């Protein structure tokens, strides 16, 4: 006896939104904060003074 | 079938770096702190008032 929402259903059409959609954040810090040395081979030796006169 | 780091080892030299290599610091302070006298001989005499009337 009436055109209901179930009869109009094919004429009804959902929307989308990006308001809550994000990439993962870049939370990493140690390369940003500490000194970086560019290595050229798997092992590097770092001599240090140990004792003195 | 695969080679390896252990098979190839004689091809793989280690690097060297100065990053933690520090010479000894100059921690000495009395010559910068106190009055300095440039002595010209082994001994210098410093007269002082000892008693008074």
């Amino acid at each position: 006896a009436d055109t209901n929402r179930t009869d109009a259903a094919a004429l009804i059409q959902e929307a989308y939104s990006d308001v809550f959609l994000d990439s993962v954040s870049e939370t990493a810090k140690v390369i940003g904060t500490f000194p970086v040395y560019n290595m050229g081979t798997k092992t590097t030796n770092l001599p240090v003074l140990s004792t003195f006169p």
Side-chain angles (χ1 to χ4, degrees), chain A residues 49-53:
Chain A
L49 180 62
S50 176
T51 76
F52 56 67

Side-chain angles (χ1 to χ4, degrees), chain A residues 13-51:
Chain A
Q13 179 173 330
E14 296 182 9
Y16 291 85
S17 178
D18 61 356
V19 64
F20 298 160
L21 179 64
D22 291 300
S23 303
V24 303
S25 52
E26 186 59 277
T27 73
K29 289 287 158 65
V30 300
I31 283 169
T33 61
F34 298 118
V36 166
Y37 171 68
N38 297 110
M39 302 167 73
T41 171
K42 181 166 178 169
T43 299
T44 303
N45 293 285
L46 307 184
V48 297
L49 180 62
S50 176
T51 76

